């Protein structure tokens, strides 16, 4: 029997045990228990949250799902270095890394809107919070490593006018080729586009709804009329796209198209550079502030609005451990006083994979301490309540087995488990 | 004296090492040759994960062995 564990229709086979012990391998993780009984117990756990969010219809958007695959693809280039690199690594193009990752960032969400639904309404008070701490040994006081706040102005390289107008260019010729029957558009997007994924499959994205496509490219797709007529030029986030519709088929349309993108060079880079050192140079000089900077100049979308405060995605604050930090401006910062502005330097942003040029300013550091309930409340109060989340969970779970079908590979009869005193050997 | 460098994707290289290279140093020859950064690289010989300051000796590491890798924050 290959099968270890049941939970309703879903079946937890030795393989899955296998690959689940070679990722605690990889990461290095210490057993307190026997690990032959506490992986595939945790395995059954996993499915047992699938298995209610199927029962309270809990479900991710696409969306949010394909927004998390790139973020963690450009954390995987930074760390890297270069996509090349990682394709390698995986020995997959990018885009068959992105098709991989799509399911296990689904379920990962999947799982965590259950467990917010579940443990979401705990609630600690500060007397809580001291008591915890209170009633712990000496050297067991939580260690605050040092944090700083940061604040960033961003501009984008400028594209010179003749490389976009090179782009047009070619856009128009392939344009004019095959409406004259003189080249096939799958031909000059083998040859030319430069949207890999689709480029391969001459062009093809296959089947996609409206709000699954960036919406200039929307636009201009749902208002082509037949399978030969090739879109106008259409600008995106990607770069310049030509659009031919292949097939509406309900609700959804399948296109083809060659995606062209201007080229930014070193040369670009060193005058947006420049131009930041400039508005630096403007701060020092007291002309303006660097609140009024990033309010007015910024091109940072998520900080411009708040005076350039980069938000920390681990916390929901401006803290951020240097770790956390994306690598550029980690450092740019750890040779950084308070107050200082930094030189310009080129980041790759990991929201949408774009070069971008920053300058940024060390708002504060806070060095590294032992945490006190006057000073470090946040940090005490987010371990408690992790801990009463997790005892919630716990109970959770015995509750849900009670309630759900499940069947364990007698092999494992012996095992002490956490969460099922008296479980059915059969299958 | 080599040693094989695998991670759990179809990617294997060969690396030329000497039993008292330390760790740091492996993951310097590994950036040096394809260009992981090497305070995010992670080696793992027999099921334990290699201290930087110790040397494939201490570790027993012998040639023509197969030396595990993944990468902190990609598959670690």
């Known amino acids: 029997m290959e099968v270890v564990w049941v939970i309703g229709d879903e079946a937890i086979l030795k393989s899955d045990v296998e690959e689940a012990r070679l990722a605690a391998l990889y990461e290095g993780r210490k057993f307190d228990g026997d690990p032959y009984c506490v992986i595939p117990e945790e395995l059954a756990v996993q499915k047992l949250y699938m298995h209610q969010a199927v029962l309270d219809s809990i479900e991710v958007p696409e969306a949010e799902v394909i927004q998390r695959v790139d973020y963690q693809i450009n954390n995987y280039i930074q760390a890297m270095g270069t996509r090349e690199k990682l394709e390698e690594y995986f020995n997959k193009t990018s885009t068959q890394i992105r098709e991989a990752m799509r399911e296990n960032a689904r379920d990962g969400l999947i799982v965590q809107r259950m467990q917010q639904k579940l443990v979401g309404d705990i609630k600690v008070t500060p007397a809580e919070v001291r008591r915890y701490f209170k009633e712990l040994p000496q050297d067991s006081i939580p260690y605050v490593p040092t944090q700083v706040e940061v604040q960033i102005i961003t501009q984008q390289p400028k594209i010179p006018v003749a490389e976009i107008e090179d782009v047009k260019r070619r856009l128009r010729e392939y344009t004019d080729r095959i409406n004259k029957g003189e080249s096939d558009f799958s031909t000059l997007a083998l040859l030319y586009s430069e949207d890999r994924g689709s480029a391969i499959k001459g062009g093809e994205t296959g089947f996609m709804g409206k709000g699954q496509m960036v919406p200039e490219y929307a636009n201009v797709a749902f208002n082509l009329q037949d399978t030969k007529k090739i879109s106008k030029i259409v600008e995106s986030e990607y770069g310049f796209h030509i659009i031919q519709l292949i097939e509406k088929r309900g609700d959804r349309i399948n296109t083809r198209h060659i995606l062209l993108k201007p080229k930014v060079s070193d040369k670009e880079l060193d005058e947006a550079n420049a131009r930041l050192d400039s508005i630096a140079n403007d701060i020092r000089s007291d002309k303006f502030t660097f609140d009024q900077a990033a309010s007015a100049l910024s091109q940072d979308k998520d900080t411009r609005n708040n005076h350039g405060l980069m938000q920390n995605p681990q916390n929901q604050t401006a803290k951020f451990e240097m770790q956390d930090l994306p690598q550029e401006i980690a450092k740019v910062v750890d040779k950084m006083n308070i107050g200082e502005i930094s030189k310009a330097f080129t980041m790759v942003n990991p929201k949408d994979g774009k070069e971008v040029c920053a300058i940024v300013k060390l708002k504060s550091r806070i060095n590294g301490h032992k945490a006190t309930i006057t000073d470090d409340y946040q940090n005490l109060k987010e371990i408690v309540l992790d801990k009463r989340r997790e005892e919630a969970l716990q109970k959770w779970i015995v509750e849900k087995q009670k309630h759900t079908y499940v069947r364990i590979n007698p092999a494992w009869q012996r095992c002490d488990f956490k969460y099922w005193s008296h479980p059915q050997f059969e299958k | ?76």
Do not use: H
Request: charged share 30%; hydrophobic share 30%; aromatic share 8%.
């Open chain 2, 1 to 76: 004296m080599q040693v094989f460098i695998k991670n759990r994707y179809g990617w294997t290289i060969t690396l030329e090492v000497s039993p008292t290279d330390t760790v740091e140093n492996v993951k310097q020859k590994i950036q040096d040759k394809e260009g992981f950064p090497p305070d995010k690289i992670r080696l793992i010989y027999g099921g334990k994960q290699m201290e930087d300051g110790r040397t494939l000796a201490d570790y027993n590491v012998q040639k023509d062995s197969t030396i595990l890798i993944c990468i902190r924050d990609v598959d670690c």
